[PDB]
Design a protein around this ligand. Structure first.
Ligand SMILES: [Mg+2]
Ligand SMILES: [Mg+2]
Ligand SMILES: [Mg+2]
Ligand SMILES: [Mg+2]
Ligand SMILES: [Mg+2]
Ligand SMILES: [Mg+2]
Ligand SMILES: [Mg+2]
Ligand SMILES: [Mg+2]
Ligand SMILES: [Mg+2]
Ligand SMILES: [Mg+2]
Ligand SMILES: [Mg+2]
Ligand SMILES: [Mg+2]
Ligand SMILES: [Mg+2]
Ligand SMILES: [Mg+2]
Ligand SMILES: [Mg+2]
Ligand SMILES: [Mg+2]
Ligand SMILES: [Mg+2]
Ligand SMILES: [Mg+2]
Ligand SMILES: [Mg+2]
Ligand SMILES: [Mg+2]
Ligand SMILES: [Mg+2]
Ligand SMILES: [Mg+2]
Ligand SMILES: [Mg+2]
Ligand SMILES: [Mg+2]
Ligand SMILES: [Mg+2]
Ligand SMILES: [Mg+2]
Ligand SMILES: [Mg+2]
Ligand SMILES: [Mg+2]
Ligand SMILES: [Mg+2]
Ligand SMILES: [Mg+2]
Ligand SMILES: [Mg+2]
Ligand SMILES: [Mg+2]
Ligand SMILES: [Mg+2]
Ligand SMILES: [Zn+2]
Lengths: 142, 175, 38, 209
RNA sequence: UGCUGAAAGCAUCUAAGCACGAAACUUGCCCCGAGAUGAGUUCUCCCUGACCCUUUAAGGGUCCUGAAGGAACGUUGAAGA
RNA sequence: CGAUGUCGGCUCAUCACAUCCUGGGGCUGAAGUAGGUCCCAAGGGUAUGGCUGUUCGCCAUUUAAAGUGGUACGCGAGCUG
RNA sequence: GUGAAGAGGGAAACAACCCAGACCGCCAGCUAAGGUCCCAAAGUCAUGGUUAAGUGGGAAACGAUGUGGGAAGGCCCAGAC
């Protein structure tokens, strides 16, 4: 016989709501990337997105240890020659706090079209509310 | 340690409200409120506040001794108040008070006006002397530092705003 | 402010204090003695 | 503060009594009429949408004419939109005259500049010409070098090169307003505004004062 | 640079807590900008027919219909290779 | 070594900061003015001529200042020679 | 000793380092170095400590009441500091 493979048509996906208040950033993010990848399912398949849709709320109340709130630095580059930019953690939290979770998970996900498809299922919200009540999402504690 | 072991006796006319780590001390001069560190255990021994290291922490006696000397100062502030005196050394240097503002004339091309905070009341007996009173010690010291900062005293003549108690180490302009 | 690798007490009134990860000598008597390890 | 939509009529001069000639730019400002009021509950921000002038009725389209008919207002040659300050509001069919600028002193004029077409780096970026003699082979107005040798095999972004010059939105700031003639719908500003003669202008009160 | 303040009965700008502080940083000024594929928002306009088939489905075909609008052409432009 | 055009100038520049100016401070054997020195700071700015192939340099006269370096001692499928 | 004339696994990538020497095939199992949060296979294992520096994850003379442990000492309820 041959080893089973999941099929993207017959695969079922579920919805989960995670509250990110007070939780450690990376220890949250690796469980999110685990469940977006689908490595908690027996029908895991590397080339198939078998993960679950995840709504993350209270993203602005995520916690880091140490002095990383003032010392963790998010660099990027605009393409232009001087265009190195820089923002700290608490600046990113005040300015645009969803990016912190998005960046950590994007770094823990695979690189490619499938990893970008896994990232499309991550839906973060700074507040405590969402418009996705129509999908009947279950709660999940991480 | 030696500071934290000595309990702080609340006198009469001093109302004390314990709320978790939040401590409100009222009195005849005003109310003061301070949230302590979670490493500090505070308790009222029927005439005194005592200050112990809460377990599961590290800087126990350090935070306890800080919360001790703080609530001692909060008590003295709400039953006596603090009084910081400043004097002005220099020609043409003067001060005037308008309620909760101070109109300094410190040899600038522009008038200096300083708004007073909430629980701080000032008074000029003389033009070259400022006496300010209030409850919080950190605040009267902060306001006196700000008022000193306009004309920090010159070492060649002692000229400028000084504390009424500090010493001004002078310097001779040699040749 | 002298800024050195070697900061030392220069008089009886010098006091070595670590403010914000930096060894600093402060002297109430002589302002020349104030140092900063860097 | 909101602005008004006018049109560049031309330039002239105002002789003062003192013997000073003030070069002014005549901006006729017809009645800007509002067509839509945008708010926080529907649109997320507070602004108005105005129209001015007239337009041929056979040429104005049914979507556009329904948009003017809902406000109940005569069409115009365009639709512009001005963000509202606080404590400031307007109705829908309201007409706005140039008397709004009756007590302003400086304005910022936004217009579309003249089209220079495809311009070289001498004209566009004010590069120096090379030597017109002393041996120059076919390289009199060229840009010269554009990079460096192998370290970044590549030209950097935003390198100043030739291309389209003009025909773009520019804003001239802090123009002293001279005269406000509400009767013939004019606005005389000191100096030269962008745009050719007969083009639309956006006159807003000066933010830098 | 400080305030209060312990550890370390003092002292101490710091360990807890608080304040000030530069042409740098982020904003504020100007321009581009929803291919921002995370492709967004608002307003307005248009189309309100019949039937056949099988492989029955986001199916195929016939006849009728051809909207809003657009494109094309022409006259052209202080727009433009 | 079955070819990687090697001084200098021109035009184009761009980065570092061990900062020349401007900016903020500390000490001064800092009266003031003007300075010395060190610390922070790279946002912008940062000469024209005579001689010489010159870089450099000297000189003249300016300037807030006339920075130090990297970039195949930047740049010849861009010029010159 | 390896490469040359030697593949495979690891050290990010990395002839010469570490493990180990490819007859062929298998959708079987055990291990080596090295590893076990995710990219990326396997311990968010257990027990007891240390570090607060993102040290780990680049560097000296020298400097410093950082902090943990140990052995000894001299003042001290005849009252120390
Ligand atoms: Mg050094
Ligand atoms: Mg043109
Ligand atoms: Mg020339
Ligand atoms: Mg030729
Ligand atoms: Mg020629
Ligand atoms: Mg490359
Ligand atoms: Mg103290
Ligand atoms: Mg103190
Ligand atoms: Mg500022
Ligand atoms: Mg300026
Ligand atoms: Mg050769
Ligand atoms: Mg060849
Ligand atoms: Mg520096
Ligand atoms: Mg100085
Ligand atoms: Mg510069
Ligand atoms: Mg720059
Ligand atoms: Mg800036
Ligand atoms: Mg010269
Ligand atoms: Mg001559
Ligand atoms: Mg070199
Ligand atoms: Mg060269
Ligand atoms: Mg060079
Ligand atoms: Mg070349
Ligand atoms: Mg050459
Ligand atoms: Mg070439
Ligand atoms: Mg090998
Ligand atoms: Mg190998
Ligand atoms: Mg390696
Ligand atoms: Mg490899
Ligand atoms: Mg092993
Ligand atoms: Mg990979
Ligand atoms: Mg795994
Ligand atoms: Mg564990
Ligand atoms: Zn000293």
């Amino acid at each position: 016989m041959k080893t089973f493979t999941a099929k993207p048509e017959t695969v079922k996906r579920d919805w989960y709501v995670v509250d990110a208040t007070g939780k450690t950033l990376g220890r949250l993010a690796t469980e999110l990337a685990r469940r977006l990848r689908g490595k908690h399912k027996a029908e895991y398949t590397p080339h198939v997105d078998t993960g679950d849709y995840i709504i993350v709320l209270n993203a602005d109340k995520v916690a880091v240890t140490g002095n990383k709130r003032t010392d963790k630095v998010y660099y990027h580059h605009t393409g232009h020659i001087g265009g190195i930019k820089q923002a700290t953690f608490e600046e990113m939290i005040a300015r645009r706090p969803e990016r912190v979770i998005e960046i950590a998970v994007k770094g823990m996900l695979p690189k490619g079209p499938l990893g970008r498809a896994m990232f499309r299922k991550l839906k973060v919200y700074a507040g405590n509310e969402h418009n996705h009540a129509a999908q009947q999402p279950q709660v999940l504690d991480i | 340690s030696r500071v934290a072991k000595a309990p702080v006796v609340v006198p009469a006319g001093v109302d004390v409200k314990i709320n978790g780590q939040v401590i409100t001390i009222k009195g005849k001069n005003g109310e003061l409120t301070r949230t302590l560190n979670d490493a500090v255990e505070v308790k009222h021994a029927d005439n005194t506040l005592t200050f112990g290291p809460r377990d599961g922490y590290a800087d126990g006696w350090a935070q306890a001794g800080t919360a001790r000397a703080l609530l001692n100062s909060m008590v003295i502030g709400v039953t006596e108040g603090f009084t910081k005196k400043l004097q002005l050394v220099g020609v043409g240097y003067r001060a005037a008070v308008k309620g909760n503002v101070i109109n300094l004339s410190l040899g600038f091309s522009h008038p200096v006006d300083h708004q007073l905070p909430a629980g701080i009341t000032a008074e000029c007996p003389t033009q070259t002397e400022i006496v300010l009173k209030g409850a919080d010690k950190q605040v009267i010291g902060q306001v006196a530092a700000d008022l000193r900062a306009y004309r920090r005293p010159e070492p060649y003549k002692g000229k400028g705003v000084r504390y009424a108690d500090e010493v001004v180490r002078t310097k001779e302009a040699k040749k | 402010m002298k800024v050195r690798a070697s900061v030392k007490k220069l008089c009886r009134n010098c006091k070595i204090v670590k403010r914000d990860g930096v060894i600093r000598v402060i002297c109430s008597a002589e302002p020349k003695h104030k140092q900063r390890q860097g | 503060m909101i602005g008004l939509v006018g049109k560049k009529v031309g330039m002239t001069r105002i002789f003062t009594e003192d013997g000073v000639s003030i070069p002014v730019t005549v901006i006729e400002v017809e009645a800007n009429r509002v067509t839509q009021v945008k708010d926080l509950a529907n649109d997320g921000y507070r602004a108005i949408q105005v129209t001015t002038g007239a337009k041929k009725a056979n040429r104005v389209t049914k979507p556009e004419a329904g948009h003017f008919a809902k406000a109940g207002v005569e069409a115009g040659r365009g639709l512009w939109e001005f963000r509202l300050a606080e404590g400031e509001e307007f109705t829908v069919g309201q007409s706005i005259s140039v008397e709004l600028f009756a007590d302003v002193k400086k304005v910022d004029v936004t217009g579309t500049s003249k089209g220079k077409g495809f311009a070289g780096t001498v004209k566009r970026w004010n590069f120096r010409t090379q030597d017109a003699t002393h041996g120059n082979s076919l390289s009199h107005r060229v840009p010269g070098s554009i990079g460096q040798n192998q370290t970044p095999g590549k030209v950097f972004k935003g390198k100043k090169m030739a291309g389209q010059m003009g025909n773009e939105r520019v804003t001239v700031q802090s123009l002293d307003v001279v005269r406000v003639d509400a009767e013939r719908n004019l606005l005389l500003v000191k100096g030269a505004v962008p745009g050719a003669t007969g083009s639309d202008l956006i006159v807003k009160p000066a933010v830098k004062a």
